[PDB]
Design a protein around this nucleic acid. Structure first.
Ligand SMILES: [Zn+2]
Length: 56
DNA sequence: CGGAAAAGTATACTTTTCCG
DNA sequence: CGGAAAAGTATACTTTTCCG
């Protein structure tokens, strides 16, 4: 176990330290940044439709 | 007030390393 | 030398806010 370089929560449902230099222990900083860094992959949107296809 | 897009967190699949 | 297990990586999928 390590720590995030922004969050800091030992109980990480799924880590992301990625042996390199920094240690993004959390899954929030990397995955949430999808839209906050650039154009989030439309892949997650394609399945997102699963909700939008039921009611609209 | 409702729906659409943003957002967020878990999970599913995958990989990398260690040890029998 | 290969299997196993946890971390890694990103999409999946449901909720919420906000504007039409
Ligand atoms: Zn973080």
């Amino acid at each position: 176990s390590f720590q995030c370089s922004n969050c800091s929560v030992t109980e990480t449902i799924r880590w992301r330290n990625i042996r390199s230099k920094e240690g993004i222990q959390c899954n929030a900083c990397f995955i949430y940044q999808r839209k906050y860094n650039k154009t989030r992959p439309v892949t997650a949107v394609n399945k997102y439709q699963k909700r939008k296809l039921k009611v609209q």
